[PDB]
Design a protein around this ligand. Structure first.
Ligand SMILES: N#CC1(OC(=O)[C@H]2C[C@]3(CN2)C(=O)Nc2ccccc23)CCCCC1
Ligand SMILES: [Zn+2]
Length: 394
């Protein structure tokens, strides 16, 4: 898997992407790696934020499926035309697949200026593909058409006129032992739609937030590489920010800082990391009544941004924010860890990443087991709409 190491790039806060080729002859494009969605979709018409885009008509192996697709996210949306073509990952497995591709013809608040990606690779399950679960996701096609094992793993590595470059690895088809240290701990995938997990306890510097554990998973908790922040349900966000504010209270920051909308700075090299607390999320274990914890540092949840004006200073953005759509374990969380998406065994593994940023006193940690007795159920059941109910599934 050495040829897949360091195959991801991007700008801090703007997504990690992998190079792919679509079509014959191959058109090269940079594709956002997104475990929070299930479509393969590529810019296919001019846009102010795209250098280049997919030209269906220049590919001898394109086949039009004569069907449109509309995809709205909580933030951002796009539409396009469905088809299939030949697809490869140059710094990936040595194979070519015929996959579904959505050629994006219109978009809004989707493409990111300066990000250097032109599409998205949705690595989650068919159940949330658009327009429905009969549009086979890319990874499913890869596994079906080739020998590739039904697993992939992600190592996202954290960081004056441009945002910092970042690197990572997407290991397709297995696990590379150079990318982590210590033990790999797995949490069950609750349901194969998103990569949904269950958080059973949250601590901030060793202190339990003491919420009903359903609040942590209201309305779901998911691992999404394409979400940049750690995003927490309103109630949890507010408890968490109250505790982090308390720990850091020698420093009085503006409200904008805690809303993720304003940088705070210190003289080069003098950041008082030790006044910010560690956050531990306890995830359900493979064994009943077991859990293990993943522990992240302020070096993960404070994102570095070099200020054009005060470039003499180390400045940071707060990269935890409020959610109304569940807990999202985004790139902030993932930057601590080597994360194994073990679709074959319906589980997600975490180990301490060999590239996580830390300091001389504290480290991002993956530890267990921890045991409850009569561990209550922490999962939420989403209200079922008539629209959703009426769908058939043949
Ligand atoms: N909506 C949603 C969620 O994420 C997604 O659907 C994908 C697409 C994403 C980031 N991950 C998004 O949302 N906007 C956006 C914009 C550009 C690139 C990637 C994305 C996040 C909330 C919980 C459900 C899943
Ligand atoms: Zn029917």
């Amino acid at each position: 898997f050495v040829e897949m190491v360091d195959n991801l790039r991007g700008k801090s806060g703007q997504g990690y992407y992998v190079e792919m080729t679509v079509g014959s002859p191959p058109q090269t494009l940079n594709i956002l790696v997104d475990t929070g969605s299930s479509n393969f979709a590529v810019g296919a018409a001019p846009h102010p934020f795209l250098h280049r885009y997919y030209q269906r008509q220049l590919s001898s192996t394109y086949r039009d499926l004569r069907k449109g697709v509309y995809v709205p996210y909580t933030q951002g949306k796009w539409e396009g035309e469905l088809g299939t073509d030949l697809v490869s990952i140059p710094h990936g497995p040595n194979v070519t697949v015929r996959a579904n591709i959505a050629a994006i013809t219109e978009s809004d608040k989707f493409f990111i200026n300066g990000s250097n990606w032109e599409g998205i690779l949705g690595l989650a399950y068919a159940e949330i593909a658009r327009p429905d679960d009969s549009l086979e996701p890319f990874f499913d096609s890869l596994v079906k058409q080739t020998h590739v094992p039904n697993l992939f793993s992600l190592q996202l590595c954290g960081a004056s006129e441009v945002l910092a470059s970042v690197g990572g690895s997407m290991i397709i088809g297995g696990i590379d032992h150079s990318l982590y240290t210590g033990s790999l701990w797995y949490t069950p995938i609750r349901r194969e739609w998103y990569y949904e997990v269950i958080i059973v306890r949250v601590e901030i510097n060793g202190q339990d937030l003491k919420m009903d554990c359903k609040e942590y998973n209201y309305d779901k908790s998911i691992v999404d590489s394409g979400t940049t922040n750690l995003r927490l349900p309103k109630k949890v966000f507010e408890a968490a920010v109250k505790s982090i504010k308390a720990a850091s209270s020698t420093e009085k920051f503006p409200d904008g800082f805690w809303l993720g909308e304003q940088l705070v700075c210190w003289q080069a090299g003098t950041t008082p990391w030790n006044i910010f607390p560690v956050i531990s999320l306890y995830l359900m274990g493979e064994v009943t009544n077991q859990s293990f914890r993943i522990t992240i540092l302020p070096q993960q949840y404070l994102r570095p941004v070099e200020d054009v004006a005060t470039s003499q200073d180390d400045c940071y953005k707060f990269a935890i924010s409020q959610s109304s759509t569940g807990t999202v374990m985004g790139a902030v969380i993932m930057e601590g860890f080597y994360v194994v998406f073990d679709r074959a065994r319906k589980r997600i593994g975490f180990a301490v990443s060999a590239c996580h940023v830390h300091d001389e006193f504290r480290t991002a940690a993956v530890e267990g087991p921890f045991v409850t007795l009569d561990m209550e159920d922490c999962g939420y059941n989403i209200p079922q709409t008539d629209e959703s109910r009426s769908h058939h599934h043949h």
